[model samples]
Target chain A: STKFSDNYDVKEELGKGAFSVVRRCVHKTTGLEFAAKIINTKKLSARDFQKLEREARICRKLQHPNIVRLHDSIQEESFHYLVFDLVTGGELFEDIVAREFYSEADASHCIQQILESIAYCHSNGIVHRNLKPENLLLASKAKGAAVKLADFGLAIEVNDSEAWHGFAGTPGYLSPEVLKKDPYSKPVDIWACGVILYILLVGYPPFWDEDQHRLYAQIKAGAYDYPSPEWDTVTPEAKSLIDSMLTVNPKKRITADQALKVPWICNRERVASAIHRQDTVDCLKKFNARRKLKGAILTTMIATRNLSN
Target chain B: FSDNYDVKEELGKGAFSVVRRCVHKTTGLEFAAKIINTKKLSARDFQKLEREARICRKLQHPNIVRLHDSIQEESFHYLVFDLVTGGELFEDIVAREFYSEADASHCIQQILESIAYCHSNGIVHRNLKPENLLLASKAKGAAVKLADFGLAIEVNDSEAWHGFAGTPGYLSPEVLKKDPYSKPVDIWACGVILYILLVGYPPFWDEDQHRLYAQIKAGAYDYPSPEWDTVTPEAKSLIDSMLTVNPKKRITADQALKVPWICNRERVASAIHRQDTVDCLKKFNARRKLKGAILTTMIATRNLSNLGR
Candidate 1:
């Protein structure tokens, strides 16, 4: 019924991804800022378009404080635009890495919000196949800004069939079940959260490899470890929660509800250590830089492959 | 600087804003661009504008004017709404040579439906008046869309009201008492609007603001003389239910919707053309317009002083 430009005055370009280019826009009436993810419909295949619609449908259903909201979705003759809350504080990893002090309590707080959002999604029979540091955003630049889960391009609704097939999500964050090319459901998200929690505490993903095959092999066997000095100061309770989530068996993996109930995540500031991990913050800066370069290469690869498909 | 919209003629003006007719450059759809002079607004008023936009965007109903777009400039905020052309409801009613209870019933039904939608969604349109109820077009049987949600709020289970809000005559008893009020306040205002629709004057009318509030608190109103002689019993009964002194006991918009006069207007609604009612409405509408003009001027002058400072 309406064009995106009809209602929103587009300003500067925020960023570009594999499928869409996000631009800063202000709603013409409300005058509040929003991020408009403009995807060229002409560039997408039938399945790609289906995913776009599915993403909108799934996002419209899930509403939580920890989740970035889809304000409106407009499909034009040549373009499909999805409007979202303009989260200015940038990615979660970037926020933590820039901080002078990073504590286990801060990491715990971040994981708790992620779990709460994932719990909401799972309760509605939806799985966030892509949960990573890049998708986790800070709502603002404020001291107590909320961590919001963003990017539902890989989000899917799971039905009672008990088996779901997909080779979706980032390499490092992919679950053991997914890496094995086995049927997986909501546990894939918890596995990703475990990966996120690990990085949040120590500033580097648990699983890493230069070769994609080797990375998959490590994830498939749950071969990742809490290395040396990095794990020394981190609470055992935190590691235990991660172990439950990163379990080799999907069935044995801790659910979002269970993870939330875990003392490390639930008890928050009290249960988690208060000591600042300056080393973790330093490590995050390096990780963030590497991640950005890898993301650019991955986006280019996906864009070319998507067109070829 | 809003290149998206081509500004046209002026639609209306308030103390801090001027509503202009705007055409969307991409879609060519016409909209009302309420360009607000932000320099005149207080910091709290800016917050109010954001809140109003947030609340209005959440509401999308056939009988509710849609806020299509919002934009902010350095000097002004532009809120683009549906370009409703049929003018004010009372002005429309007064212009008609012959009016009937059925006509008023139809109008009230739309209002009730809009309110019912709001209540079900946990929103309260804290202000409801004739000015807010606008006809979508000048065409016959054009739909009525409720406009202006400046005082609306999203409510939780237990919400208390401490501030004064809403139009003087339409302010609910609870709101006047500085007590906790919710969705029922909207119903009360609808009741007042319904009464005025039938008889050309509000149920409780007084020149003095204090006396007017006293009358509202006491629920001191009745179907008077020749004006309401033609109004249906069912119509009066519906108003009575909505105008209950205790908000807890007041009839909900959903309940009011089911009343015989509103729900089955064709069967039970009185269709008698009351010339007296129309004439009285003309007088009442004129008086209200004069008073509104004077009040608007007062505000304009006051705002002018603020702008100078």
Candidate 2:
């Protein structure tokens, strides 16, 4: 039986997802900090529980600086608490966008660490289906630095010969095969990495059409248009690696191993400077500007319809 | 790419098929050759080959044996790896029944070196069983090389395409449960090796396949036998680092390198000497006769008996 201290106090919500909630907690006596992910066991079906068990097992076996640590797991009645190493800085996506285009060095450094962690996961046969900047957490102690891949809720084990079915990843980042409802494998993560790399370098995704058909068509056709002003300065090797990774055909897409060999992703100097020069404030301003423009366009259409009526 | 090599005698066999020992007719350099039966494979299998080849080509490291050439014939695909003459580590361990602490440490050090090299290159040896580890023929006095990239994985890149492929006995808990695993699985396999070195068998093994699998799932087995008491503290510490169920907390290749026993140059030299003696005999025999007695012995010993039975 699990024993709980009567004075243990809840601090604040760390993150909330569809299946569980993460909260910062403190030991009433010692005042030590901890992150408690409270998973509601009763709400889960047998299959879901199995998934939870699998994730826990995965977490328990993974020991890496870049992968989140599972300190303990407690099952209390209808609740299952997964205690993890409490990290402070927050999500990596915000940091990337805030910096505008992260220097190649900084992006490579981050990607290297991320790759180190992901490679560890892959070695153990675990696939993090949903790999995006949002899912990546930075250690609070390090500020907007030292990122770790988190959230194994969507992670699955796939054999070399096995293909996964169903829509299982973030929409914009998902591979074309996934969008087509065809069987896809882990290379989908590579495609997402390409999108992330593009966003990091260009401050925008390659295909940003609001219409689903147009957006998917652009992605499917691998129609990436690089403006000379922005992309001309980038290394040909870097561009080649991105092109291979972002290939429309899942079959032809470059593997993570191959991507690392690309001069841009593996170059130490390129990756380091990228993270150092990121300007969060400017990125936010641009984002806000885009939002404002969209808002004005919507308002004008609404006003015109009212006058017509 | 493999046109340079003149493929010859079949050296080994498994559930998949036979592996031949090939030579570059011009240079007379040797390579371990794997001839995959394409007809027996599904589309997924071809995909896996493509993935493996793609990953392997990008990996360049001293410890990781190189993929010199890969050729596709009409009905088969040939993967040619740098050939090392020393027999499997499995043969050495099984023949000796159990290894001394120094011997075990020497063996593990080689493993750590290979793993560290792979990690530095963003690769992970997902399948790190004794059978997969081959010693170099030149391993005399102080050198040992690691061979086999068939199940080796590149972890550093962002792709998720390669699926789970590992031996059952050496797999980590996360792998068995189908959780997202990383390079820590290699450490877990190192733990299994440690156990086998000191105890002559895996910590969790049974005649009944189901029971053996169940025991592995539970991870309730311990090294409490009197035989374990004779194990050195340093060796025990190494095992503890490897066997920590939490992968995040497991000893990394860098950390493993720092362990006293692992770094002992004298111990490494002695172990290499032992390997060299065996390898020399095998090589001498091969020189004296074509398709040597050693090759026949390897075939007899390595063949999967279940096929005929």
Candidate 3:
């Protein structure tokens, strides 16, 4: 009934997504382990399926320290099995969620690694169209694990024209050029990196909304503010990096290489900040908990489904 | 000096242990400190608590709620853990407005992994129910933690189980008959949770104590329409396998992991048949047919009959 090699013993799941599920698989004879990303085409549209293939193909060619590596892929009936180097440490927010603390140094290290990963992608003529905290996984679960780039399902190869139109990523981190339906290039990812760094330091997104219209409007306008108390202790160099990354004009936006050159990023070891860092983690915890609780409470009122009431 | 933690508030009260909220004095981080008064601790009771702590220390899965530290003073014993603010899974379920089966799958996946961790280590969570499961937060896909390790005990290769523990509706038929059960009992309880997640009500319910026990022994419950029709056959089949009346015939935790319903949880039916479950619970409340305190207490502490033991 199946055709994949018998040596790989596919086992329990590692991670899950709408169209794919990642499971921990081991080589029966070699005693090696890998995460097998199995994409189910049953629920995915044709275009999304193509997107998955493109992403997989692009991942197969990539080899970098910060990038999650793809070892091999096999196609089975209604499924695509991708064996990848196991990077299961969890996400970048391990500091806030697990450690109950966030430091300026944490953000600096993660962004440097992520930027280096993107720089590699840029050099390879590839564009990772989607980037977010959920896609950023820790390489280890212990106290101080490195963050790595993962989930290249929306990735694609970019020709010299270097721009493509149409939405292909999450809304919260969508760049202005992408929101405007303009042909967007790699800078879109830079903007997302800025959003992620904002969350990394501040414990919440830079731009968000209850409705898609307002969400896109803010994205297109590239409008966001760092409140006085929240940003008071943030390094000016850090702010300038974000400022350059989130610039409305893609041409004016900082490239991944240029971001690596930013003063704070270049000399991150010496950059010191004592902002409302740990406090934001506590704030973010309560904020997310409250929102989730509110969501659950409101939904329950409507859900007593079968009663005669 | 007990200067490290500032006692915040009483979280819960139990017959053996009282839980209090405590914040790390330095970082402002929070934890639930389960404190036991040494004066009330019997040798047997003290050993049980220590065994629970020892077991927790040995196992390290994300879903298995952990005991981080054990502190002893002149009159009290403190078991500290990361504060779970989301409360009981069932309590949150009754309060939630938006529902997703996919999220439910993630929780169950973690549960299975935790159970497998226990089963492999020859430990069986003698109790596994919604009341014992706690959530990490209100984050989009929050983690579900398995708690209440008081009854969890290690077993020999025989998988022999004894004594009467766990809530009324969740007790497997084998336990009702005072038969020697094992990990299958936990699997049966997981079945109950799956049913509740789908229908918003317990599958086996009744006003008569005798009838309730009889129904459980007979493995009496149904996927009655319009509540049952919507759920995929795969889901029902897994539930049927878990809720199998005979422990010898019941699905093993490992087998459940391989089940398509569980293995493909995210891809399986995104919807559950909740009307029957909701109606079954609400009818008792609105019609005033059930005894008031009995139902309330049953909903809370896991009522015990003690007749068999």
Q: Taking the candidates in order, what DockQ does each have? A: 0.01, 0.01, 0.05
Residue pairs with clashing backbones, model 3:
A90-A138, A296-B95, A296-B96, A299-B96, A299-B97, A300-B96, A300-B97, B199-B274
Candidate 2 lDDT (Cα, whole model)? Answer: 0.66
Prediction-by-prediction clash tally = 9, 34, 8
Please, what are the lDDT tens digits per residue for candidate 2 over residues B150-267?
5766677543434557777777777666766777788888888767765564677677767877877676567675655555566667777787766677789989898777777355
The regions of model 1 sitting more than 4 angstroms off are: A1-309, B40-42, B303-309
Please give the distance, in angstroms, between residue A89's alpha carbon in candidate 3 and its true position after superposition: 1.4
Most accurate candidate by lDDT: 1
Each candidate: what lDDT? Answer: 0.81, 0.66, 0.74
TM-scores computed on chain B for all candidates: 0.95, 0.75, 0.83
Error of 3 at A151 (Å): 1.3
Chain B, candidate 1: TM? 0.95
C-alpha lDDT (0 to 100) for residue A226 of candidate 3: 90
Of the candidates shown, which would achieve the greatest DockQ relative to the real structure?
Answer: 3
**lDDT per residue, candidate 2, A201-287, as tens digits?**
655567778898887777767778777666666566557767887887888888766666666666666433333333323443354
TM-score, predicted candidate 2 vs. hidden true structure: 0.43
